[PDB]
């Protein structure tokens, strides 16, 4: 696969727009959204060339590790053009004012809004988005050699995407560094949201839906 065709592969893997179809209600709406998105995330991963050629233990572990960072990366791309807006779904747009209504959220909404702004400033392209989202999955903690080759080919695809912008050699390297340094920021947010969700489940205050419950429990 040419990096161009890998990226079209990823374009073609994109999950659909999800809608929640209408305090407690904000949280209930986020968990219900998380559960629907995890269903589509599984199909998305299955369509990454070579992902289904990995051991089922590897597939399970990469999705169990990475799922919240992959939900959050998607949130930031959907939010990129809408500063002050976290575009969870078309029927679910939240500002930090609403964030306030539930203890521990505002901190999370703030990290997501900060990071989102960082990507807006860098003018993150769609094709860069596609590569890095995949990288987040593949780079989460024989099949070992198949995964190194898959991660190395998405890395290759992102360097090509960047090459195509036309900017100087120096500027490409600096663009590549700036996008990749933002991954530890997504992983930071991810750790915070998972912590808050584990605490929410422990108290039985939101419905921790079937696929969502399984995915939280893995951690």
């Amino acid at each position: 696969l040419s990096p161009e065709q890998l990226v079209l592969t990823l374009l073609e893997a994109e999950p659909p727009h999800v809608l929640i179809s209408r305090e407690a209600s904000m949280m209930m709406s986020l968990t219900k959204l998380a559960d629907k998105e995890l269903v589509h995330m599984i199909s998305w991963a299955k369509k990454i060339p070579g992902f289904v050629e990995l051991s089922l233990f590897d597939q399970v572990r990469l999705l169990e590790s990475s799922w919240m960072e992959v939900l959050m990366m998607g949130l930031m791309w959907r939010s990129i053009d809408h500063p002050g807006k976290l575009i969870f779904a078309p029927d679910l747009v939240l500002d930090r004012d609403e964030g306030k209504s539930v203890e521990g959220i505002l901190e999370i909404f703030d990290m997501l809004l900060a990071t989102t702004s960082r990507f807006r400033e860098l003018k993150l392209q769609h094709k860069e988005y596609l590569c890095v989202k995949a990288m987040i999955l593949l780079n989460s903690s024989d099949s070992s050699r198949k995964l190194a080759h898959l991660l190395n080919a998405v890395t290759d695809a992102l360097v090509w995407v960047i090459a195509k912008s036309g900017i100087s050699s120096q500027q490409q390297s600096m663009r590549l560094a700036n996008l990749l340094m933002l991954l530890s920021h997504v992983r930071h947010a991810s750790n915070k949201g998972m912590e808050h969700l584990l605490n929410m489940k422990s108290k039985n205050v939101v419905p921790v839906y079937d696929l969502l419950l399984e995915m939280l429990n893995a951690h």
């Binding site: 199909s43 299955k46 597939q59 169990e64 079937d210 696929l211 419950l213 399984e214 995915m215």
Partner: peptide
């Protein structure tokens, strides 16, 4: 429940 593996193994 094993819905991750169910969805990973079917379409």
């Amino acid at each position: 429940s094993h819905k991750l593996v169910q969805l990973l193994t079917t379409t």
